[PDB]
């Protein structure tokens, strides 16, 4: 078995020059975005009135068409400008700035990867995005800003042409993933290191990507705990840094020697935003 320090050494020594990254809700909680709807929250209390019979319903087409308002409440919260990237995002950004990032795969819909400065070409947003929207009736496309006013004012955005409800390009349940998601066929075999941060690995097809690298490739998990294939069906070059994700990241960064560059970066970026 290898160690965090080992992986850091492989990067410092340029053994591994192409890193694929998988991330999930865990990397955004430090920015103050809740996950499970478990929490007593500004979110959970707002949706409380709305009477979602259960959390999954917010991403379900039949429920959305019956009552789009609980979902647009969520949209109001996640719309760009409300939350800021945290060190985990900035770490990924540094990883790209240094030439290490093959591709970043995110299940998050908060758009914080893009906001941190990571180029779109390097990003696969697998659950979609609030950057654009589509009319549910006529299929006419719209940039996210066209519905911004309605969303902030709590009005359901309606199509200017057909009056149909305009839905942000978030992936609902039972919908296929965006087409960029198919890059994983090229990406994963080409990858010499896999990074997995802040994810349960319960949502598919996204989850299965973990198995898609070669046996020679180390899979480093930074998460509260062991999850998915890394647990059920582990591998020799697998590595777990278990605990709070920000601490796992800060440790790696220090092992990489990037701590001071990393702080200068985050300081400059965060200051700019708020």
């Amino acid at each position: 078995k290898l160690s965090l320090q080992d992986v850091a050494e492989l990067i410092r020594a340029r053994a591994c020059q192409r890193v694929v990254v998988m991330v999930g809700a865990g990397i955004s909680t430090p920015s103050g975005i809740p996950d499970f709807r478990s929490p007593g929250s500004g979110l959970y209390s707002n949706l409380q009135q709305y009477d979602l019979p259960y959390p999954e319903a917010i991403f379900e087409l039949p429920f959305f068409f019956h009552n789009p308002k609980p979902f647009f409440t969520l949209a109001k919260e996640l719309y760009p400008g409300n939350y800021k990237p945290n060190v985990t995002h900035y770490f990924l950004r540094l990883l790209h700035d240094k030439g290490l990032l093959l591709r970043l795969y995110t299940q998050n819909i908060d758009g914080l990867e893009r906001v941190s400065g990571i180029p779109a070409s390097k990003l696969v947003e697998a659950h979609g995005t609030f950057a654009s929207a589509t009319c549910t009736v006529c299929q006419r496309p719209f940039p996210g800003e066209d519905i911004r006013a309605d969303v902030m004012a709590d009005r359901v955005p309606r199509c200017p042409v057909c009056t149909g409800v305009v839905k942000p390009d978030i992936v609902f349940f039972g919908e296929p993933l965006p087409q960029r998601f198919l890059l994983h066929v090229v990406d994963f075999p080409m990858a010499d290191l896999l990074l997995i941060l802040g994810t349960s690995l319960e949502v598919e097809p996204f989850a299965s990507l973990t198995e898609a690298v070669r046996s020679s490739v180390p899979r480093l998990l930074i998460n509260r705990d062991l999850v998915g294939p890394l647990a059920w069906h582990p591998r020799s070059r697998d590595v777990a840094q278990l605990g709070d994700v920000v601490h796992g990241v800060e440790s790696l960064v220090e092992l990489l020697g990037w701590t001071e560059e990393m702080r200068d970066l985050v300081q400059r970026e965060t200051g700019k935003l708020d």
Partner: peptide
């Protein structure tokens, strides 16, 4: 395939 859990 669809997005599922």
């Amino acid at each position: 395939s669809g997005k599922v859990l």
